[PDB]
Design a protein around this motif. Structure first.
Motif, PDB file in Angstrom:
ATOM      1  N   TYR A   5       0.866  -1.196   0.000  1.00 23.02           N
ATOM      2  CA  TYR A   5       0.000   0.000   0.000  1.00 23.02           C
ATOM      3  C   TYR A   5       0.888   1.228   0.000  1.00 23.02           C
ATOM      4  O   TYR A   5       1.402   1.576   1.094  1.00 23.02           O
ATOM      5  N   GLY A   7       1.014   5.195  -1.506  1.00 26.04           N
ATOM      6  CA  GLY A   7       0.133   6.248  -2.022  1.00 26.04           C
ATOM      7  C   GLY A   7      -1.284   5.714  -2.168  1.00 26.04           C
ATOM      8  O   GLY A   7      -1.778   5.159  -1.171  1.00 26.04           O
ATOM      9  N   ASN A   8      -1.866   5.938  -3.344  1.00 25.94           N
ATOM     10  CA  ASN A   8      -3.250   5.518  -3.678  1.00 25.94           C
ATOM     11  C   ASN A   8      -3.167   4.270  -4.558  1.00 25.94           C
ATOM     12  O   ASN A   8      -4.033   4.091  -5.464  1.00 25.94           O
ATOM     13  N   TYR A   9      -2.166   3.415  -4.286  1.00 26.57           N
ATOM     14  CA  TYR A   9      -1.983   2.143  -5.038  1.00 26.57           C
ATOM     15  C   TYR A   9      -1.938   0.965  -4.079  1.00 26.57           C
ATOM     16  O   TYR A   9      -1.471   0.990  -2.921  1.00 26.57           O
ATOM     17  N   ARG A  10      -2.479  -0.142  -4.599  1.00 24.52           N
ATOM     18  CA  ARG A  10      -2.461  -1.452  -3.952  1.00 24.52           C
ATOM     19  C   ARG A  10      -1.767  -2.389  -4.927  1.00 24.52           C
ATOM     20  O   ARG A  10      -2.232  -2.532  -6.076  1.00 24.52           O
ATOM     21  N   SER A  38      -6.278   0.943  -7.679  1.00 20.08           N
ATOM     22  CA  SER A  38      -6.427   2.240  -6.955  1.00 20.08           C
ATOM     23  C   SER A  38      -7.054   2.038  -5.586  1.00 20.08           C
ATOM     24  O   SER A  38      -7.895   1.125  -5.439  1.00 20.08           O
ATOM     25  N   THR A  39      -6.702   2.892  -4.621  1.00 22.15           N
ATOM     26  CA  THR A  39      -7.253   2.871  -3.252  1.00 22.15           C
ATOM     27  C   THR A  39      -7.890   4.231  -2.942  1.00 22.15           C
ATOM     28  O   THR A  39      -7.487   5.237  -3.508  1.00 22.15           O
ATOM     29  N   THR A  40      -8.820   4.258  -2.006  1.00 29.36           N
ATOM     30  CA  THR A  40      -9.409   5.546  -1.567  1.00 29.36           C
ATOM     31  C   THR A  40      -8.463   6.140  -0.510  1.00 29.36           C
ATOM     32  O   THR A  40      -8.116   7.306  -0.652  1.00 29.36           O
ATOM     33  N   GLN A  42      -4.780   6.591   1.562  1.00 31.41           N
ATOM     34  CA  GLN A  42      -3.314   6.531   1.328  1.00 31.41           C
ATOM     35  C   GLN A  42      -2.679   5.426   2.171  1.00 31.41           C
ATOM     36  O   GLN A  42      -3.186   5.135   3.271  1.00 31.41           O
TER      37      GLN A  42
END
Ligand SMILES: Cc1nccn1-c1cccnc1
Ligand SMILES: [Zn+2]
Length: 140
Positions: A5, A7-10, A38-40, A42
């Motif tokens: 995890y 930033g806004n990446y998984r 993408s993640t909601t 951070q």
């Protein structure tokens, strides 16, 4: 199981990606066994930017972190794979250590941050999918 995890990446093993991962796809590569969604919220992880060959990985089938030496990212034939195609994965790093299929997703880390995730196993070797070349994980 396991993810990175950043930033806004998984970042997950492509073969473990969920429907929600594929519905929120940023990038995927079967040859590397990687998928990014993408993640909601951070994330707490930092990606290593380095050519370290020593680090520590998490092995869920031992509930243990092990220090290892590992090879630089390269192309290797994986024998009898049973969560994906079973032949020639890239950006792979090997170390001597224990790995079973459910260990996939465990982090390998060095002094600079997360190097990659467990992707392969067999014969007292563990393979890790490298993420250190994915510079775009650090921005946007
Ligand atoms: C665990 C692994 N991933 C890729 C290759 N290997 C390997 C290499 C030699 C003997 N056993 C497994
Ligand atoms: Zn490093």
């Amino acid at each position: 199981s396991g993810a990175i995890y950043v930033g806004n990446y998984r970042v997950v093993n492509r073969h473990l990606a969920t429907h929600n991962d594929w519905a929120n796809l940023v990038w995927e590569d079967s040859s590397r066994d990687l998928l990014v969604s993408s993640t909601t919220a951070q994330g707490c992880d930092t990606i290593a930017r380095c050519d370290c060959q020593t680090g520590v990985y998490y092995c869920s089938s031992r509930r243990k972190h092990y220090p290892v030496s590992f090879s630089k990212p390269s192309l290797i034939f994986v024998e009898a794979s049973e969560y994906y195609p079973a032949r020639y994965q890239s950006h792979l790093m090997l170390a001597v250590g224990h790995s079973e299929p459910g260990d996939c997703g465990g982090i390998l880390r060095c002094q600079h941050g997360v190097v990659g995730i467990v992707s392969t196993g067999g014969n007292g070797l563990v393979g890790f999918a490298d993420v250190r070349d994915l510079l775009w994980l650090d921005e946007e």
